[PDB]
Amino acid sequence: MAEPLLVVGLGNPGPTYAKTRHNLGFMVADVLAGRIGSAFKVHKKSGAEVVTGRLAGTSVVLAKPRCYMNESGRQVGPLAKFYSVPPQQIVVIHDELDIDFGRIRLKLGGGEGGHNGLRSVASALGTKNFHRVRIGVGRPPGRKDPAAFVLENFTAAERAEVPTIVEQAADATELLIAQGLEPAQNTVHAW
């Protein structure tokens, strides 16, 4: 009827760290907005920025937070009620330390493996279990801090494959609308 897909990208506007391994969450949003050709406008209330469009046959709302990890969690809450969301589906792209760098892990709702945003957004609305997009960041480091390793975007092979995996990630996000969950994840893990 008129229910949109709520896409929250875990990627806050940070001058230098928006280009690092932790930009995965923001990548999908930026890419979708990029292919559609629209910029996200500031919602003068919570300080977040959202862009509107249509993916496949459903309204897509790409929402990114103002700043800070904790803030991002409660960013989704007042916004979903702000425009009054008809619950179609909520997609939240985030970092995943347990998954190999370059591939997508799809789980329903909240779970371990990520840091803050993915966990916070679940409690902000109270409704989860849809599509929580986990982009593998590689593996836990042996020397530097795990999060610091996500702050340094350098690798051997997969470091060059970023554009490829990001385009597919954003593209598969639309497939989650048109196809579903099971045949969709099958498509994602077939390559």
PDB file of all heavy atoms in Angstrom, residues 38-55:
ATOM      1  N   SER A  38      20.126  11.053  -5.388  1.00  0.00           N
ATOM      2  CA  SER A  38      19.509  11.952  -4.426  1.00  0.00           C
ATOM      3  C   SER A  38      20.355  12.043  -3.161  1.00  0.00           C
ATOM      4  O   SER A  38      20.982  11.064  -2.753  1.00  0.00           O
ATOM      5  CB  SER A  38      18.096  11.473  -4.081  1.00  0.00           C
ATOM      6  OG  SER A  38      17.265  11.442  -5.233  1.00  0.00           O
ATOM      7  N   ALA A  39      20.386  13.222  -2.559  1.00  0.00           N
ATOM      8  CA  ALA A  39      21.114  13.430  -1.319  1.00  0.00           C
ATOM      9  C   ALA A  39      20.158  13.425  -0.135  1.00  0.00           C
ATOM     10  O   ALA A  39      18.998  13.834  -0.258  1.00  0.00           O
ATOM     11  CB  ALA A  39      21.891  14.735  -1.373  1.00  0.00           C
ATOM     12  N   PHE A  40      20.637  12.953   1.006  1.00  0.00           N
ATOM     13  CA  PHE A  40      19.817  12.912   2.207  1.00  0.00           C
ATOM     14  C   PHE A  40      19.730  14.291   2.853  1.00  0.00           C
ATOM     15  O   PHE A  40      20.739  14.982   3.019  1.00  0.00           O
ATOM     16  CB  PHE A  40      20.335  11.865   3.208  1.00  0.00           C
ATOM     17  CG  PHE A  40      21.832  11.724   3.265  1.00  0.00           C
ATOM     18  CD1 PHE A  40      22.607  12.625   3.975  1.00  0.00           C
ATOM     19  CD2 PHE A  40      22.461  10.674   2.613  1.00  0.00           C
ATOM     20  CE1 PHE A  40      23.979  12.485   4.033  1.00  0.00           C
ATOM     21  CE2 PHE A  40      23.834  10.530   2.666  1.00  0.00           C
ATOM     22  CZ  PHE A  40      24.594  11.436   3.377  1.00  0.00           C
ATOM     23  N   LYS A  41      18.513  14.689   3.201  1.00  0.00           N
ATOM     24  CA  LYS A  41      18.268  16.008   3.767  1.00  0.00           C
ATOM     25  C   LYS A  41      18.145  15.934   5.284  1.00  0.00           C
ATOM     26  O   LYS A  41      17.717  14.916   5.838  1.00  0.00           O
ATOM     27  CB  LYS A  41      17.013  16.656   3.155  1.00  0.00           C
ATOM     28  CG  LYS A  41      15.801  15.735   3.059  1.00  0.00           C
ATOM     29  CD  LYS A  41      15.810  14.921   1.771  1.00  0.00           C
ATOM     30  CE  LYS A  41      15.650  15.813   0.547  1.00  0.00           C
ATOM     31  NZ  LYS A  41      15.755  15.046  -0.722  1.00  0.00           N
ATOM     32  N   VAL A  42      18.528  17.016   5.942  1.00  0.00           N
ATOM     33  CA  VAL A  42      18.552  17.073   7.395  1.00  0.00           C
ATOM     34  C   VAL A  42      17.146  17.157   7.972  1.00  0.00           C
ATOM     35  O   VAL A  42      16.369  18.049   7.628  1.00  0.00           O
ATOM     36  CB  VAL A  42      19.363  18.286   7.900  1.00  0.00           C
ATOM     37  CG1 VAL A  42      19.523  18.239   9.414  1.00  0.00           C
ATOM     38  CG2 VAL A  42      20.722  18.348   7.226  1.00  0.00           C
ATOM     39  N   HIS A  43      16.820  16.220   8.845  1.00  0.00           N
ATOM     40  CA  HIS A  43      15.578  16.287   9.587  1.00  0.00           C
ATOM     41  C   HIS A  43      15.801  17.088  10.856  1.00  0.00           C
ATOM     42  O   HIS A  43      16.357  16.578  11.835  1.00  0.00           O
ATOM     43  CB  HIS A  43      15.051  14.893   9.923  1.00  0.00           C
ATOM     44  CG  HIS A  43      14.283  14.257   8.806  1.00  0.00           C
ATOM     45  ND1 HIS A  43      12.921  14.072   8.854  1.00  0.00           N
ATOM     46  CD2 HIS A  43      14.686  13.753   7.615  1.00  0.00           C
ATOM     47  CE1 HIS A  43      12.519  13.479   7.749  1.00  0.00           C
ATOM     48  NE2 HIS A  43      13.569  13.275   6.974  1.00  0.00           N
ATOM     49  N   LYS A  44      15.398  18.351  10.816  1.00  0.00           N
ATOM     50  CA  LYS A  44      15.618  19.270  11.924  1.00  0.00           C
ATOM     51  C   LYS A  44      14.756  18.882  13.120  1.00  0.00           C
ATOM     52  O   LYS A  44      13.631  19.361  13.281  1.00  0.00           O
ATOM     53  CB  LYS A  44      15.326  20.707  11.481  1.00  0.00           C
ATOM     54  CG  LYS A  44      15.595  21.758  12.549  1.00  0.00           C
ATOM     55  CD  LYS A  44      15.345  23.156  12.010  1.00  0.00           C
ATOM     56  CE  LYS A  44      13.902  23.329  11.570  1.00  0.00           C
ATOM     57  NZ  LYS A  44      13.719  24.560  10.765  1.00  0.00           N
ATOM     58  N   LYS A  45      15.291  17.980  13.927  1.00  0.00           N
ATOM     59  CA  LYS A  45      14.621  17.499  15.123  1.00  0.00           C
ATOM     60  C   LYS A  45      15.574  16.604  15.906  1.00  0.00           C
ATOM     61  O   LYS A  45      15.947  16.907  17.037  1.00  0.00           O
ATOM     62  CB  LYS A  45      13.357  16.709  14.762  1.00  0.00           C
ATOM     63  CG  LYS A  45      12.421  16.498  15.940  1.00  0.00           C
ATOM     64  CD  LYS A  45      11.696  17.785  16.297  1.00  0.00           C
ATOM     65  CE  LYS A  45      11.042  17.702  17.665  1.00  0.00           C
ATOM     66  NZ  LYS A  45      12.052  17.690  18.757  1.00  0.00           N
ATOM     67  N   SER A  46      15.974  15.504  15.280  1.00  0.00           N
ATOM     68  CA  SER A  46      16.889  14.559  15.900  1.00  0.00           C
ATOM     69  C   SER A  46      18.316  14.776  15.399  1.00  0.00           C
ATOM     70  O   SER A  46      19.275  14.266  15.982  1.00  0.00           O
ATOM     71  CB  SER A  46      16.433  13.133  15.599  1.00  0.00           C
ATOM     72  OG  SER A  46      15.068  12.961  15.940  1.00  0.00           O
ATOM     73  N   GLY A  47      18.448  15.530  14.311  1.00  0.00           N
ATOM     74  CA  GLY A  47      19.760  15.835  13.771  1.00  0.00           C
ATOM     75  C   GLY A  47      20.216  14.815  12.747  1.00  0.00           C
ATOM     76  O   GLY A  47      21.359  14.851  12.292  1.00  0.00           O
ATOM     77  N   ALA A  48      19.322  13.910  12.382  1.00  0.00           N
ATOM     78  CA  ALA A  48      19.640  12.870  11.415  1.00  0.00           C
ATOM     79  C   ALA A  48      19.243  13.300  10.008  1.00  0.00           C
ATOM     80  O   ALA A  48      18.453  14.231   9.833  1.00  0.00           O
ATOM     81  CB  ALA A  48      18.947  11.571  11.792  1.00  0.00           C
ATOM     82  N   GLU A  49      19.782  12.616   9.010  1.00  0.00           N
ATOM     83  CA  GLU A  49      19.528  12.953   7.618  1.00  0.00           C
ATOM     84  C   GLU A  49      18.972  11.746   6.876  1.00  0.00           C
ATOM     85  O   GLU A  49      19.511  10.641   6.980  1.00  0.00           O
ATOM     86  CB  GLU A  49      20.815  13.453   6.961  1.00  0.00           C
ATOM     87  CG  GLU A  49      21.288  14.791   7.510  1.00  0.00           C
ATOM     88  CD  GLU A  49      22.745  15.072   7.207  1.00  0.00           C
ATOM     89  OE1 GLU A  49      23.119  15.129   6.021  1.00  0.00           O
ATOM     90  OE2 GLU A  49      23.538  15.203   8.165  1.00  0.00           O
ATOM     91  N   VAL A  50      17.885  11.962   6.139  1.00  0.00           N
ATOM     92  CA  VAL A  50      17.174  10.878   5.465  1.00  0.00           C
ATOM     93  C   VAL A  50      16.862  11.255   4.018  1.00  0.00           C
ATOM     94  O   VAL A  50      16.500  12.397   3.731  1.00  0.00           O
ATOM     95  CB  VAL A  50      15.847  10.533   6.191  1.00  0.00           C
ATOM     96  CG1 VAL A  50      15.154   9.344   5.537  1.00  0.00           C
ATOM     97  CG2 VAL A  50      16.087  10.263   7.671  1.00  0.00           C
ATOM     98  N   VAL A  51      17.022  10.301   3.113  1.00  0.00           N
ATOM     99  CA  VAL A  51      16.664  10.504   1.714  1.00  0.00           C
ATOM    100  C   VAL A  51      15.580   9.506   1.298  1.00  0.00           C
ATOM    101  O   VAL A  51      15.577   8.359   1.747  1.00  0.00           O
ATOM    102  CB  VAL A  51      17.896  10.383   0.784  1.00  0.00           C
ATOM    103  CG1 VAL A  51      18.536   9.011   0.896  1.00  0.00           C
ATOM    104  CG2 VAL A  51      17.525  10.685  -0.660  1.00  0.00           C
ATOM    105  N   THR A  52      14.651   9.956   0.464  1.00  0.00           N
ATOM    106  CA  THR A  52      13.511   9.141   0.069  1.00  0.00           C
ATOM    107  C   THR A  52      13.618   8.676  -1.385  1.00  0.00           C
ATOM    108  O   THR A  52      14.113   9.408  -2.247  1.00  0.00           O
ATOM    109  CB  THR A  52      12.198   9.924   0.259  1.00  0.00           C
ATOM    110  OG1 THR A  52      12.337  11.252  -0.268  1.00  0.00           O
ATOM    111  CG2 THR A  52      11.818   9.992   1.731  1.00  0.00           C
ATOM    112  N   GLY A  53      13.169   7.453  -1.646  1.00  0.00           N
ATOM    113  CA  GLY A  53      13.149   6.933  -3.000  1.00  0.00           C
ATOM    114  C   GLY A  53      12.302   5.679  -3.112  1.00  0.00           C
ATOM    115  O   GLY A  53      11.520   5.374  -2.212  1.00  0.00           O
ATOM    116  N   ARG A  54      12.463   4.945  -4.206  1.00  0.00           N
ATOM    117  CA  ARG A  54      11.721   3.706  -4.426  1.00  0.00           C
ATOM    118  C   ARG A  54      12.650   2.605  -4.914  1.00  0.00           C
ATOM    119  O   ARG A  54      13.325   2.763  -5.931  1.00  0.00           O
ATOM    120  CB  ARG A  54      10.598   3.921  -5.448  1.00  0.00           C
ATOM    121  CG  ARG A  54       9.378   4.621  -4.875  1.00  0.00           C
ATOM    122  CD  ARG A  54       8.605   3.708  -3.939  1.00  0.00           C
ATOM    123  NE  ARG A  54       7.586   2.922  -4.635  1.00  0.00           N
ATOM    124  CZ  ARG A  54       6.352   2.726  -4.160  1.00  0.00           C
ATOM    125  NH1 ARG A  54       6.001   3.223  -2.981  1.00  0.00           N
ATOM    126  NH2 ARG A  54       5.467   2.028  -4.861  1.00  0.00           N
ATOM    127  N   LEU A  55      12.687   1.498  -4.186  1.00  0.00           N
ATOM    128  CA  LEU A  55      13.488   0.356  -4.590  1.00  0.00           C
ATOM    129  C   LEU A  55      12.568  -0.791  -4.998  1.00  0.00           C
ATOM    130  O   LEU A  55      11.740  -1.243  -4.202  1.00  0.00           O
ATOM    131  CB  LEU A  55      14.470  -0.078  -3.477  1.00  0.00           C
ATOM    132  CG  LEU A  55      13.907  -0.948  -2.340  1.00  0.00           C
ATOM    133  CD1 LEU A  55      15.046  -1.524  -1.514  1.00  0.00           C
ATOM    134  CD2 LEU A  55      12.970  -0.155  -1.445  1.00  0.00           C
TER     135      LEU A  55
END
